[PDB]
Scaffold this active site. Structure first.
Site, short mmCIF file in Angstrom:
data_model
loop_
_atom_site.label_atom_id
_atom_site.label_comp_id
_atom_site.label_asym_id
_atom_site.label_seq_id
_atom_site.Cartn_x
_atom_site.Cartn_y
_atom_site.Cartn_z
CE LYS A 106 170.21 16.67 -40.28
NZ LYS A 106 169.95 17.67 -39.17
CB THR A 129 171.50 22.67 -35.29
OG1 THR A 129 170.29 22.66 -36.06
CG2 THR A 129 172.62 23.36 -36.07
CD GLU A 167 166.03 17.86 -35.58
OE1 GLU A 167 166.93 18.54 -36.17
OE2 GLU A 167 165.52 16.83 -36.07
#
Lengths: 202, 202, 202, 202
Positions: B128, B68, B39
């Site tokens: 998440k 992000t 990621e």
């Protein structure tokens, strides 16, 4: 300017009290002990009167604001009575908008990444983190990764033993309630001195 | 397929870095150490270029995504540059919708039951959990009662000592940042190996 | 009245089970052990049938409600089958509205100050705090400052060792799941007795 | 430039492997561990494909060449696939000539003074010394007398214990095979780091 004051003073007294008289005496105690940022919460009876009667301390460099602001009606009264900043435990879109139009600094409280992002979308980058004792410095450190440009002012459980850890995590200032403000005027003025020294000490 | 990859690999490297070059070297380190899910967070400078320049690793079986992600504009750049999955710290309705139309897997971050439910209503069942160090395995176990069919991928503080507790709580995979990714390339490649073995070991 | 029942009984059994038969036997166990507030969660198979078949226990003074309610369709079935109160892990505006029109007590779950405030704006002052093991008594004590008139019923991890701390923090009642309800009927009836005594004992 | 790269990096990984995939993983391992000069030997299956698929590493500053080149046909394939330098175990006049016309650096291998002189007559002054474990540093020191301007890159048996002796004898760089390249990717990346440090250390 609001940012810069937090940055300089590093501590805001979050003042809860059972009366106007107790609130004023504790605000004086805290100021006399070196705390310039004073947040009169709206759980104080007649919190507006307290802010208005402390207005003169502004001439001595005190910065008097309002906390526990939960409606625009409360926000209006606080501003009308001379509040230089507004703080809430939660993120309030209506208070955000009112404070934007009125040109007064608003620090909403946030506990999650989603709340944080919503606050940023409303134009805020200095956030109250509340309750600090639940999330901790850990939360502040975790936010640095994805949100390097957000800064926190934790409220909740900040005390003499942990204040330096909070600053190690990257907070902008701390909001201190019961550890500072509870007790008699004399005890409060003294605890005020201890916090300033302990903060300087880190 | 996105679900099935998480299920199989069990670990996603959450890659924060100060430069394109550092990010690429750490992504290679991690892959060389056995971590296939990578990621690239958008706190990496030119995170899109990094994803594009790692596109060839896909031919070696790497799965490169973006993290992000906080706006649809960032989401578009990541997808345009070959991101196979999108991760955010928060729940973003606008990113959810864009990823739905674009046919790309999105894993929003959640910290509360209300956030969880909103994400489910937007079609998500793999979430998440962020910040994991604040809520803990306790949160994952608590969610099993009312939401037996939600699965979490915690990010935040996952390390060598607690990775097995997380899997005991019922997580689908873990996202590992600083415990994996911080240090030099050599140290990162090695820590990558340790995590794979420790995870296999439970 | 709903408030007053929580106040009087102080404990709600949060009943998760794998079958109708197990759920009914555990609800009887708990009642026989002195727990009058019984929450049949919608993770119980055919949770409506269970509520309907326990309807007679109302004549013995049991108060049977539904938990883990996540849609208005589930809410309708629970009320149709005789649920005297509705509980959810999250704050659901649609369930709030339905329960308001139907005249049935709804206790939404909340984990943050912002969620709390939204629930208050929807007319709620008794809130489920969930997951209690993540936020803790600390959260309940922190809320007393800004929100003196909100009362919590924590669910999640409440047990024999911590039940008194929760009541010390200022909770209105506790919701107890696995510490009470897990095991055989006999073990559950006995643990029910222990909780009542331990709660009386503080 | 070819000379200057050897001079600067001091180590060339001589990469033998049983598959394309193993060869690529070891070349990445070695590069990640700080070895910039990478020689893909033609004993690697489909050694050309490996060189072509590593071509992108050139953008990260890797210098990818070919080794164990024993015919002009192999030489052509290597150059066609992006080899920046050609190495052989022996002195090959036909490969010398082809590399001269093509403008690609060729380092033939030599084991005797007569072979050395023939290579010099073909325009070479940087020579692979092979097998280094048979002749040793002794050979390199002996050549300094009559051939002060020839420089060697020994291949064969160079390891952590003797690498500094080789540099003491006057070698330009070393070619390291099994001591560096054998093992798993992780072990190779690590051994790569050790060689760089040990070489710097002398």
């Amino acid at each position: 300017k609001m940012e810069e004051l937090f940055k300089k003073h590093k501590i805001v007294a979050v003042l809860r009290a059972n009366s106007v008289e107790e609130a004023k005496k504790k605000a004086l105690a805290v100021f006399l002990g070196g705390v310039h940022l004073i947040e009169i919460t709206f759980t104080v009876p007649d919190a507006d009167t307290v802010i208005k009667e402390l207005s003169f301390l502004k001439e001595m460099g005190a910065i008097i604001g309002a906390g526990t602001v939960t409606s625009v009606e409360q926000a209006r009264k606080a501003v009308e009575s001379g509040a230089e900043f507004i703080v809430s435990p939660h993120l309030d879109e209506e208070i955000s908008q009112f404070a934007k139009e009125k040109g007064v600094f608003y620090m909403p409280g946030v506990m999650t990444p989603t709340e944080l992002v919503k606050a940023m979308k409303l134009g805020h980058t200095i956030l109250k983190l509340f309750p600090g004792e639940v999330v901790g410095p850990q939360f502040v450190k975790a936010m640095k990764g994805p949100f390097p440009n957000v800064k926190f002012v934790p409220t909740g459980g900040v005390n003499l033993d942990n204040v330096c850890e909070w600053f190690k995590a990257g907070v902008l200032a701390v909001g201190v309630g019961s550890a500072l403000v509870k007790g008699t005027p004399v005890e409060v003025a003294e605890k005020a001195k201890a916090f300033v020294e302990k903060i300087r000490g880190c």
